[PDB]
């Protein structure tokens with residue numbers, strides 16, 4: 001497991017440019033990044049597909065349901081701080 005805190009920043013008329021899904025693991029909800037659009041605020045901050053989002057602005061989002069994490073991120077405005085968890089095979 002690697003861990004990295006990212007800070008994403010966008011303009012008002014603009015999305016962060018990533019998508020998430022929430023998996024009910026065996027139930028512990030884990031939310032991870034399923035897509036990141038190229039050259040988006042997300043990409044530039046270092047966000048990568050497969051990253052688990054463990055925290056949003058120091059809120060532990062592990063165990064949180066999908067709708068709440070979406071609302072949390074949307075409530076964050078234009079600055080978003082994500083603790084990511086990831087690893088690579090190679």
Ligand SMILES: [Cl-]
Pocket residue numbers: 070
């Ligand atoms: Cl949405």
